[PDB]
Design a protein around this ligand. Structure first.
Ligand code: ZN
Ligand code: ZN
Ligand code: ZN
Ligand code: ZN
Ligand code: ZN
Ligand code: ZN
Ligand code: ZN
Ligand code: ZN
Ligand code: ZN
Ligand code: ZN
Lengths: 208, 208, 208, 208, 208, 208
């Protein structure tokens, strides 16, 4: 029945994740993990989703997310890993949209996955030029805004998590922009604040 | 009569604007608003325009402009979205040429639409390389010069609005170029000043 | 007996190789070498092949291959030389299929022929556009997969040689794609990894 | 037998190394040693490797490594030399992987080769801007993590060597980051500590 | 006798060179000099060549070469001029093959002609994209290798001239590739060194 | 005969040097002297060199070197002048290699030319940032090491002059790094000492 198919999906994804994790040259691992996530999104979309099978799908997604985040963090050219992480975020948004919503614990798992992704991406952007870091950060914030719009759940947790992510983004911006003349500080900081305020305004209107 | 068809146009444009605004992936949204603006320009050009139906057309255009500006601001690759903004500016110039001129309140609405477009485009250009920023800004100034050439109204409002826009452009250039060696400062700043001066000179010749 | 005909083939191929090697305008040299390889393959297919005459045929093939590789390396338009290399490796596959398999030393000679061909083709593709380089490399790896499937021998040597060739291709691709925006990196890399993984899977299955 | 082929390889590599070492313009020399190392790894992969021929292969590798390190140190543009050293590290990692493991003395030779490579790379990066230097150092430590994963041997030697190498990296980072505002100190240093801790965690988990 | 025909050829070539040199639009001038060189080659091949008439033929060739080089340098699209220069080099190679060899002074004249051609072509390629410059220089090196193989004379002058040309090409490449990321320099520079080394190996073996 | 051609070269180089010296905008002057030195190198290489014509070639080189050094000292952007001086050093190294060796007086002239070049380079680098000054000095000492390897003569003069140049460079470094925190003093100074010690070691090995 549903249990058998879900467990078969579990096993297949588990073997593929192990195999890709074992490998070297993390960029190829990232591409393979993205393709695995895509085929998994397709298989989930085909199968009928109910409240019974949600936890297993969520933990499969968590396994994929942890493996991909660790592989990306394992060291590579920062810009490449940044775009790979953005595509991962978009695919994960599609995944959570397809999954649906359930008991709060799975939402907590998804939120902590999101937060680990944010931390890893900030850590990777830590070593770029100020302008490139600004571009990566604003695009990444837009991606999180799209995700938070897609997610369904109790507003308080979503708002608090988004505000916390915003605080980390702003703190890193203040850290990094210190090595430029303050005119560039004004420029980039104003851009980042405006985009993050726009994201906040949408999330507030949507979840108000 | 005229009221019926104008209100029908209002309704269709409103529904299309809502539908496209709801959507994600803002670039396709800008494409859709461009096509809607084109077909609306066509429909208005076809219909006989009188003083009675002008305010409704003006507010329809204002709805279109606010939706497009907000969508462009909502985050994307700056260069693509800014080129879309330039195309929107050209189509808006065609639209205002088609509409004609009337009581001052509309003209104020069009001027603040222009202002929102300019601020949003400067905001988009805030996070580019200095050379690409200068290209975008000079093209933008050319587009606004064309628009101000097209518009008809009281001289004081047009001249003051153009001088204001020029001041924002100059201030943004002064902010952004500060991150380069002063020779490039001289080069790019001289180019921007000369093109903005040419724009001022035309507006003065034609519209004084 | 067999010695007489084999040595006559040796002498004729030697003279033709000398004459073609002496000439300039390398493209006609590769064309003539391809025609020589075709007449040689027909002659070998006609003659009965046993373990006694194998080494002489193998060294004749090695002479032809070294001459062709050196002439191709001697400088020409890269894309034309890549086409000639593809035809050459196809005819070489047919040749090794016709020859049969024997003591390990001849297999080592054939493998190092293949590896020299790979190095020369990578060296030639070194100086093209990224997309054209991707096309050349993907066609090349398809040809190598066909060869490795065709060859018979101890699995360990073939698997190790294929892995080394794959790593060479990957290193060159990582070098070359550095001059493009990382989205193109993602695209072209993902294509290359996927085709190389398909080749690896087949060779592993059929040599398993 | 095996001795004859191994000694022939010894002689050929020796002559090529002498000829390239005699030459000027160290960048071409580094390219030539890279190609020599590639052909040597190919030849070794082809030949059957046993305990008898391991010391000669190891000392050939040591000759190649000393020549390459000395040539890189002999003066050039630092950043190009850094990427050349990274490519050499990757190729020599594949070389030790192909060689296999044996009596401890050869492992000592490989470890001191690695350590001299690290010292040379640190010395070359000594004269770069802080951000670049950080990028070069993190990429280099990722390469060393890959190597230390690849090598097999006694745990204590590998763990101690990696810890010492990490300490040299950290000491250089501390010395170099002194010429920046402390915010950039925080940023870059935190990135370096995090990546080095990731390397340590893998080595400990996999190899402990 | 021979003197009469040689002087008539001198006069005809002189008049045609004057007329083509007077004209503007340098590309048609280059085409005209190419056709003049071809017809002069045919005429020389028809006439019997002895030691008596060699200097006059050599100075006619020098006149043609100086006129063509000056016209090519006089400004045009770089790629078109490079193509024309390669065709000119091939035709002049055929010409010197037809002429034969003689007293050292004429060989010095031919060598300085080749040096001027190399300088002009390098100066023209000075203003191209790095990849296109690499293609132009590799084609140039192939053409010079063909010429140096064709020429007969004392080995020392040929070897020294080839080494000097190689050093000029290397210096220019070291200038040009400095504007690209170091991976691109690795790639293109490795290609250039490898092709120049192949050219050196041939000229050394052939002419040693 | 030899005197005639050598004196013609003398006159031509003299006129070109005077003409370029008269001109302002010293950067174009350095470019012109570089091209003159290149063509002079070619012309000398073509001509047969003997002990009879050596002094005239040496004094021509001295004229060119004094003119170039004076023009470089005459004021320009320091970094551009530094790169031009390095290229001049490489070209003059090629020139002296072409010239050969002779009576001690010409060697003294060449050595004093070298020393004046070094003094001018230090004087120009006197007004740069500490890191840029370090890069200029390291590249420059590498170039002088290459030259000293190239030159042939009595060991005592070469060793003494190199030691004196090392003392000059070291004294200038102790001057320049005085305005930095002592950690940067340690870093850059250690780099300089290590590089200059490696240069000394080579010189001792080759010339001992
Ligand atoms: Zn899919
Ligand atoms: Zn990790
Ligand atoms: Zn339309
Ligand atoms: Zn918005
Ligand atoms: Zn060759
Ligand atoms: Zn290889
Ligand atoms: Zn050294
Ligand atoms: Zn001219
Ligand atoms: Zn030259
Ligand atoms: Zn002066």
């Amino acid at each position: 029945n549903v249990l058998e198919k879900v467990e078969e999906l579990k096993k297949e994804v588990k073997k593929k994740v192990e195999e890709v994790a074992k490998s070297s040259n993390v960029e190829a691992a990232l591409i393979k993990l993205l393709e695995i996530l895509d085929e998994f999104i397709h298989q989930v979309k085909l199968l009928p989703v109910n409240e019974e099978n949600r936890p297993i799908l969520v933990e499969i997604l968590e396994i994929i997310a942890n493996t991909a985040v660790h592989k990306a963090r394992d060291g590579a050219e920062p810009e490449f890993a940044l775009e790979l992480l953005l595509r991962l975020v978009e695919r994960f948004t599609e995944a959570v949209k397809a999954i649906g919503t359930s008991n709060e614990e799975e939402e907590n798992k998804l939120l902590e996955i999101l937060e680990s992704i944010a931390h890893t991406a900030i850590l990777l952007a830590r070593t770029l030029t100020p302008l490139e870091a600004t571009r990566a950060l604003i695009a990444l914030v837009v991606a999180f805004t799209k995700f938070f719009l897609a997610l369904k759940g109790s507003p308080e947790k979503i708002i608090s998590t988004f505000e916390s992510i915003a605080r980390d983004i702003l703190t890193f911006a203040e850290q990094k922009l210190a090595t430029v003349p303050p005119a560039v500080q004004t420029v980039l900081l104003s851009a980042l604040l405006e985009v993050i305020e726009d994201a906040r305004e949408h999330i507030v209107k949507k979840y108000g």
